[PDB]
Amino acid sequence: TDTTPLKLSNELYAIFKIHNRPYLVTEGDRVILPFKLKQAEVGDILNMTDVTTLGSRNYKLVGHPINTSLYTLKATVVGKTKRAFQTREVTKRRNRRVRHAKSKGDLTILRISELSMN
Amino acid sequence: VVKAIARNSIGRNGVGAFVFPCRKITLQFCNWGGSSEGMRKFLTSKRLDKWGQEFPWIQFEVMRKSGHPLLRAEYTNGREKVICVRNLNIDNVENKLKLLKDSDGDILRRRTKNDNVESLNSSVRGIWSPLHAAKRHR
Amino acid sequence: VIYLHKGPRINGLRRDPESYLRNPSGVLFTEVKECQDKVRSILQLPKYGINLSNELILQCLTHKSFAHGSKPYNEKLNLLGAQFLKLQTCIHSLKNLQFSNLGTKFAKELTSKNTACTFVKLHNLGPFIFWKMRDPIKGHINGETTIFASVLNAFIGAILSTNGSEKAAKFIQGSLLDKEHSLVNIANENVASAK
Amino acid sequence: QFGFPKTQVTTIYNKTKSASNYKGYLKHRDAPGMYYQPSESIATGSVNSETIPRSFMAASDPRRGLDMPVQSTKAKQCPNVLVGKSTVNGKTYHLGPQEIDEIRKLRLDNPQKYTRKFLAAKYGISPLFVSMVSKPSEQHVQIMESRLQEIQSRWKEKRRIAREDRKRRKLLWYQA
Amino acid sequence: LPESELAKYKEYYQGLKSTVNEIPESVASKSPSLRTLHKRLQLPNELTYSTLSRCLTCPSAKLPDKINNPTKGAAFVNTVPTNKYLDNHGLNIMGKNLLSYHVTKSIIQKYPRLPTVVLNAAVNAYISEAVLAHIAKYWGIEVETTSVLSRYLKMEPFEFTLGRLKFFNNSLNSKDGIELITGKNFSETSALAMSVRSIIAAIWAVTEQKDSQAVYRFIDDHIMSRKLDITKMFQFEQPTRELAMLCRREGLEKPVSKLVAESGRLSKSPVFIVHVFSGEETLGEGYGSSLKEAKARAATDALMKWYCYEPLAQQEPVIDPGTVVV
Ligand SMILES: [Mg+2]
Ligand SMILES: [Mg+2]
Ligand SMILES: [Mg+2]
């Protein structure tokens, strides 16, 4: 697959999928994953082994896990923090008891450090 | 003629090097005070030493104050999380500490549905135009 | 009646192109290779292995004032060169580990434009450069010294551009031999002391 | 050149009726390989390499030979917009030094009789050129300035604000 | 009088001063803050902790006469007179020089033909004082905002002091909204910048021989990694003329703006698309609410294209013929 016009461009985007959730990024972006990572700690680096689509302004390589040979896209883990706390109030319509359903889900923050053709 | 209008660069923490977000952690406790028992135990138990060994880029202060026990933590961005570990036990305190370390200092905030990426880079492809569309409308 | 005014000045008409493309030496910009070779020889570019194109050399030689900057400019390269040059000087000072030699008069002298100009004059590279006199008869008051300095810096910049840093550094070192730039600096310092 | 298959940004749903719906796009998946997707967008603020014209690339850059700052529009068809008369019919350098001097003298003497337009008419030459050549009596300029000031004063509140806004807009429109 | 507290305090002060003069290695090692800093930035191990301490120490020889007026705004009670041969003053200059060189070079590499003014602006953005201060803050280089007497009372070792940044900071400088305006020497931001520069200088010093490019790499990781959109730096006077001049200079047919598409004429908000053609090669697309505006935009676009051209690493270093002049 002739991958020269991706090689030559300066701006380039990628659509990698973590657990099938697609995120479309360039280098320098901050991806907020809506879950807590146990594999990676803070400061670790993830090489993305599933990238659906690499694209320039006018050309785009695509494929179900396209070869890791072709590109280098690697993200560093910055933060593991939770999204803000909420108490959604659950109740019926003539019943005095209420069930406070609390929610403070967790986030993993990445930074796309490298995004290049290989 | 070309005139320059001033601006400044925006820091992207992880793209070149990665500075570790947490910098100082202050284990605060009290000799007297049952609420501070777990904290005291933690301080005693070589766990702190182990933690230090693990993570040398972050410094651990150990203060003595009369109130409830705390874990005030200080981050790169400037902000400071503070967790009162009232009446917790050793393991829970450790967990709290871990949580503190993991977080970047940034404030908590409600995310909307699917707001994942956060860029300051102009779109690689342009913003759509009706006149430069491949398919005209009717 | 395509009149391409060649006189002193009218403030409106375009001139004959062949009137302002002659530098104070006289040479036509379009004319000049031999000159480039001579310049190279003067520099001593071979020895350090500094390959420069003739075009680059020409650009280095010329200045903003010549041809209203219509022909290759000079300025960016000069700017680069100065930045490099200062750093190099600082490093030299450090070498000759102690950091209490930097903010001194000698260093300043070494850095300065006047010194550079003097060096250029000594070398005998003045005839080659392209620029315009403010008033043909008035010598440095036409702003010659600054131009010379720029040219010197421009050369350095060009070398940097061609060759990645190390080569440039080597060249600088060669230039600043105590056996042979710094000998001029000392003289300048002495002069300053005297006045 | 490249012989890639080209495609629109496809949706499994009807584009006409539901183009903003992200889900459709996500659902769509295309056969692995390279593709040509012309950007559905103008290249005004852009600095992308696939946006730069071949004439502005250096004679060495491999991108010159490649074909992705496409010349889709053709200059034959597009009407000239807000162009000077010298562009449509080439510039002229007919006017000598004596003539210029005379013009200057005239300007110095009587600006209201011998205004720029009049001068242009006389010497088959642009008003801009005339202006470049010759400064009018400073008194005249002063008078003009005064007049302008008066006009400005005569404005209402709203108009001034509008003017300011316009100015701001103008300023903006050279940023890109 | 069983306790001469003034004497003890004096002794302590003297000790502190001595330490500052020396920056003993052992003491530096003992300091936790310094250690943390070292780990954080992944500095080379050849760089000692004494050096680090020195970097954080700004030149403070003699206490000013501005101190004697705390009634008039300022009071300097935090600092202790530094050794003249062991300050960050020299290092700082070197660091600055390095920043000037390397950043500029990088910018040039990125964008040949970048108008000189614009280039300068970019450089400033990359390494202005404020930016440097911010960077320092991020790193965690904190300032000594505690009086010597206070420190003594606390009974904190000299290690902590060493770890902190040290310059003539005005204790009581923004109290009751009164700010005593002084020179560059007494500003926090400036100090921070100096410290940053000093660190770089130190790095250079240690890795001048074993790995010359190490410093540069470090800078890239930290200073050059920062986003700056170069497109946002420009501002043109009348760009059309400039464009024409550029065309003349190069081997291009005179530029002409032409209508490509138009919609909503006779409306509050129309759209006109004008390209600036040079023969056939379209030189700049430009949209606008008015025709004039569109034309202007096209010209600007063309100019941007000309300037912000970013050639590849596989190309042979391109050198522009300076800036267009009209
Ligand atoms: Mg019921
Ligand atoms: Mg209810
Ligand atoms: Mg529908």
UniProtKB/Swiss-Prot annotation, chain A:
Single GO MF annotation: structural constituent of ribosome
Domain of life where this protein originates: Eukaryota
Signal peptide (residue range): none
Record carries keyword Transmembrane: no
Disulfide bonds: none
Chief site of localization: mitochondrion
Cell location: Mitochondrion
GO cellular component, one term: mitochondrial large ribosomal subunit
A Gene Ontology BP annotation from the UniProt entry: mitochondrial translation
Subunit and partners: Component of the mitochondrial large ribosomal subunit (mt-LSU). Mature yeast 74S mitochondrial ribosomes consist of a small (37S) and a large (54S) subunit. The 37S small subunit contains a 15S ribosomal RNA (15S mt-rRNA) and 34 different proteins. The 54S large subunit contains a 21S rRNA (21S mt-rRNA) and 46 different proteins.
Function noted in UniProt: Component of the mitochondrial ribosome (mitoribosome), a dedicated translation machinery responsible for the synthesis of mitochondrial genome-encoded proteins, including at least some of the essential transmembrane subunits of the mitochondrial respiratory chain. The mitoribosomes are attached to the mitochondrial inner membrane and translation products are cotranslationally integrated into the membrane.
Misc note: Present with 1850 molecules/cell in log phase SD medium.
Family, similarity comment: Belongs to the bacterial ribosomal protein bL21 family.
Listed name of the protein: Large ribosomal subunit protein bL21m
Gene source species: Saccharomyces cerevisiae (strain ATCC 204508 / S288c)
Range covered out of full length: 44 to 161 of 161
Curated annotation (Swiss-Prot), chain B:
Assembly with partners or alone: Component of the mitochondrial large ribosomal subunit (mt-LSU). Mature yeast 74S mitochondrial ribosomes consist of a small (37S) and a large (54S) subunit. The 37S small subunit contains a 15S ribosomal RNA (15S mt-rRNA) and 34 different proteins. The 54S large subunit contains a 21S rRNA (21S mt-rRNA) and 46 different proteins.
GO terms, biological process: cell redox homeostasis; mitochondrial genome maintenance; mitochondrial translation
Protein name (Swiss-Prot/TrEMBL): Large ribosomal subunit protein mL43
Protein family membership: Belongs to the mitochondrion-specific ribosomal protein mL43 family.
Disruption phenotype: Has a respiratory growth defect. Shows complete loss of growth on nonfermentable carbon source and a gradual loss of mtDNA with replicative cell growth and an increasing number of generations.
Main location: mitochondrion
Miscellaneous comment text of the record: Present with 3400 molecules/cell in log phase SD medium.
Swiss-Prot record, chain D:
Subcellular locations according to the entry: Mitochondrion
Record carries keyword Disulfide bond: no
Biological process annotations from GO: mitochondrial translation
Highest rank taxon of the organism: Eukaryota
InterPro entries for the chain: Ribosomal_mL58 (IPR024388)
Main subcellular location: mitochondrion
One Gene Ontology term, aspect cellular component: mitochondrial large ribosomal subunit
Stated family: Belongs to the mitochondrion-specific ribosomal protein mL58 family.
Functional summary from the UniProt entry: Component of the mitochondrial ribosome (mitoribosome), a dedicated translation machinery responsible for the synthesis of mitochondrial genome-encoded proteins, including at least some of the essential transmembrane subunits of the mitochondrial respiratory chain. The mitoribosomes are attached to the mitochondrial inner membrane and translation products are cotranslationally integrated into the membrane.
Name of the protein: Large ribosomal subunit protein mL58
Organism: Saccharomyces cerevisiae (strain ATCC 204508 / S288c)
Lineage: Eukaryota, Fungi, Dikarya, Ascomycota, Saccharomycotina
Swiss-Prot record, chain E:
GO molecular function terms listed in the Swiss-Prot or TrEMBL record: double-stranded RNA binding; ribonuclease III activity; structural constituent of ribosome
Entry annotated with the keyword DNA repair: no
Recorded superkingdom: Eukaryota
A GO CC term assigned to this protein in UniProt: mitochondrial inner membrane
RNase III domain segment(s): 75-141
Main location: mitochondrion
Gene Ontology biological-process entries: mitochondrial translation; RNA processing
UniProt subunit comment: Component of the mitochondrial large ribosomal subunit (mt-LSU). Mature yeast 74S mitochondrial ribosomes consist of a small (37S) and a large (54S) subunit. The 37S small subunit contains a 15S ribosomal RNA (15S mt-rRNA) and 34 different proteins. The 54S large subunit contains a 21S rRNA (21S mt-rRNA) and 46 different proteins. mL44 forms a heterodimer with mL57 and stabilizes rRNA expansion segments 1/2 at a membrane-facing protuberance close to the point of attachment of the ribosome to the translocon in the membrane.
Role noted for this protein: Component of the mitochondrial ribosome (mitoribosome), a dedicated translation machinery responsible for the synthesis of mitochondrial genome-encoded proteins, including at least some of the essential transmembrane subunits of the mitochondrial respiratory chain. The mitoribosomes are attached to the mitochondrial inner membrane and translation products are cotranslationally integrated into the membrane.
Note: Present with 300 molecules/cell in log phase SD medium.
Name of the protein: Large ribosomal subunit protein mL44
Span covered, complete protein: 65 to 390 of 390
